[PDB]
C-alpha cells in the first residue's frame, strides 16, 4: 500500500527494491535495482517523472518532487538521480539532476534545475540554488552552497562505501 | 481516518477539500473550500486553533502548529505553503508563497502578495511587508515583486487547486 | 503498530509513554517514563541504540537516528538524550548526546558526536557540527551554531516548564 497511481502513471520497480511501509510513492517513479526508500519518505512523480538509479538510498524523511508547470517550465521537469547516490535524512530534492556517486548531506535542499555532477559531496544543511551546477569531484557546503575544495581519492571511495553500506542495510530489512 | 480530536475540538472542513490519507489533522483546524493538504503533513490545532483560507495548498511534509502557551495559526486565501515548510503560530495573508523548507516562527506576520525564498527563516514577531521578495536565514527584504511575479502567486494557487481536484477525481 | 523490531531488537517502553499512531519506532529504542513521541516522527535504532530520558518530548516531524557503521565507528554509535528535554518540531538528531533540560529549537540539525550539556537552548533552524560541545547554561544559534549568551534564570526555569507542559499535553492525548 506504498505505491499509488496518478492517472495512468504508476511506479516501476526493479529488483531488490525496499520501500518502507510508512512511505508514499506516487505516480511515474522509476526505481532501479537495489534502491532503498526509508521511513516517512514521499516521492511524487505526477506532472513529470522521477528516476532513481541503481543502489541509491533515499533516507528517512526525504521529500522528492518534480518541477511544477509554470511559465518557466510549461511542461515541468523531472527529478533524475543516478546510481550509488546517498540521499541523506530529511533531504528535499526538487526537479534537479544528480549524477552517480553523490552524497547529499542530511537536511539539504536541492532546487529546480540544479545539476550535480558525479563524485560530489554536499554537506548537511546545505541549499543548492535553482539551476546551479555542482562540478564533479568537489565538496560543496553552505546555504547557498559554495565550492569548498576537491574531494580526495579516499573521500570519493567513501561515496561508493556509503551506497554499498546502505544496499546491505536495506537487504537486512528485506530479510528481517 | 486523517481527522482527529483534541478534547472537545475537531476539524471543520469546507467544500472540495483534499487531505492525503498519509496526513494528520488534529483538533481545532478550520479548512476553507478548495484547501489541499498533501502527503505526510501534520496540522495540530490543540493549544490554539489553525485557520486556513480558501484555495490554499499545504504541500508535502509541512508541519503546522500554534504557539506553545506557557497564538493561533492563521493563513489566508490563495496561499502556497511549500514542501517541508514549518509554520508556527504565525499569520499569513492572501496570495503568499512560502518557499519549500522555510521556517516561520511565532508571532510572525506576512502581508499579502509576498514571496519567501526556499530555506528561509522568519524570526518571531517579524512583519514582512506586502509586495516583496524575502529570503535568507533570517530573511532579508530583497526587492519588490514584479507584476508577473504577483500573477505567478495567483497561478501557483490556481494550479494547485486544479492539482488537488486531479487527485480527488481519483 | 508503531513499534517495529530490527532483527531481535525491539523498543523498550517505560510508564505513561505516548507514541503517535503515525510515527515509526524501529529497533533498540529505549523510552523512559513520560516520554512523548508526537506525529510523523521516525526513531531508528538499528545499528546502535537510541536512549531517551524521562519526561522528554520528541515533537512532530523529528527524525532520530544513530551514527552509521564506518571505518571510524565499526559498530556505530548511539543517540543519547537526557531527561526533561524538549526536542522541537522537525528536529534532526544524529548520533549525538544531549544532556538534561535542553531545548532544541524546531528545524535544527544536530550531527554525530555533538555533545549538548545540561540547561542549554538551541535556537530554531540551527546546525550543530559533528563533535561540537555546547557549554551548559548558554544559548546557541546559527548554522553552524555560535555561543550567543548565557541563559537568564527565567529562561533556565523555562526549560523545565517546557518539558513539564509537554508531559501534561502527552497525558491529555493518552487519557482520550
Ligand atoms: Zn513540488
Ligand atoms: Zn509547536
Ligand atoms: Zn542516519
Amino acid at each position: 500500500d506504498v505505491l499509488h497511481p496518478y492517472r495512468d502513471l504508476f511506479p516501476q520497480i526493479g529488483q531488490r527494491v525496499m520501500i518502507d511501509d510508512s512511505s508514499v510513492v506516487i505516480g511515474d517513479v522509476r526505481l532501479a535495482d537495489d534502491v532503498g526508500i526509508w521511513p516517512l519518505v514521499v516521492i511524487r512523480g505526477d506532472v513529470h517523472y522521477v528516476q532513481i538509479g541503481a543502489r541509491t538510498n533515499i533516507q528517512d524523511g526525504s521529500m522528492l518532487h518534480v518541477t511544477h508547470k509554470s511559465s518557466y517550465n510549461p511542461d515541468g521537469n523531472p527529478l533524475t538521480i543516478g546510481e550509488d547516490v546517498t540521499v541523506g535524512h530529511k533531504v528535499m530534492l526538487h526537479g534537479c539532476t544528480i549524477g552517480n556517486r553523490v552524497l547529499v548531506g542530511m537536511g539539504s535542499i536541492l532546487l529546480d534545475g540544479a545539476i550535480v555532477e558525479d563524485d560530489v559531496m554536499i554537506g548537511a544543511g546545505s541549499l543548492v540554488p535553482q539551476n546551479k551546477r555542482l562540478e564533479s569531484g568537489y565538496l560543496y557546503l553552505g546555504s547557498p552552497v559554495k565550492q569548498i575544495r576537491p574531494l580526495s581519492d579516499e573521500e570519493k571511495a567513501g561515496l561508493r562505501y556509503s551506497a554499498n553500506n546502505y544496499v546491505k542495510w536495506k537487504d537486512e530489512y528485506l530479510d528481517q
Side-chain angles (χ1 to χ4, degrees), chain A:
Chain A
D1 300 60
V2 298
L3 304 181
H4 308 286
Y6 173 65
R7 294 177 181 175
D8 64 319
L9 302 175
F10 196 78
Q12 296 234 299
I13 310 301
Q15 304 298 297
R16 302 178 299 280
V17 172
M18 184 286 284
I19 302 176
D20 196 79
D21 297 314
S22 70
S23 293
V24 186
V25 181
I26 304 165
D28 192 0
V29 178
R30 303 85 168 291
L31 306 180
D33 303 332
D34 297 304
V35 162
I37 306 304
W38 297 78
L40 299 186
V41 166
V42 179
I43 306 179
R44 182 148 67 88
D46 35 17
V47 292
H48 214 125
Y49 70 79
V50 174
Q51 181 173 191
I52 305 184
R55 303 181 301 285
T56 286
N57 59 83
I58 305 306
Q59 296 177 59
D60 324 56
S62 290
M63 202 291 115
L64 281 55
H65 197 210
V66 297
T67 296
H68 308 174
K69 301 181 182 302
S70 68
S71 59
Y72 304 70
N73 302 292
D75 297 299
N77 273 307
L79 169 58
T80 306
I81 304 171
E83 292 167 41
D84 294 321
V85 173
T86 293
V87 175
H89 306 287
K90 286 185 165 294
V91 165
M92 173 84 238
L93 302 182
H94 208 270
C96 55
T97 300
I98 300 175
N100 310 313
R101 303 179 301 285
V102 171
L103 185 155
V104 184
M106 67 187 101
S108 295
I109 300 173
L110 276 60
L111 303 176
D112 305 86
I115 300 175
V116 184
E117 309 193 326
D118 306 330
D119 300 304
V120 168
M121 184 183 302
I122 296 169
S126 296
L127 185 155
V128 181
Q130 306 183 309
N131 306 312
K132 185 178 184 60
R133 177 184 293 284
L134 303 194
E135 298 165 48
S136 180
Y138 287 77
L139 164 66
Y140 284 83
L141 281 157
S143 179
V145 297
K146 290 182 176 180
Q147 187 183 68
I148 307 304
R149 62 176 173 69
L151 295 174
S152 66
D153 288 326
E154 294 183 359
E155 296 182 304
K156 284 184 278 191
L159 296 174
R160 181 179 285 82
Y161 172 88
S162 179
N164 181 68
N165 184 55
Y166 250 107
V167 163
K168 299 162 61 180
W169 214 331
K170 58 85 179 176
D171 280 333
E172 198 168 1
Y173 277 85
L174 291 175
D175 241 294
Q176 199 64 242

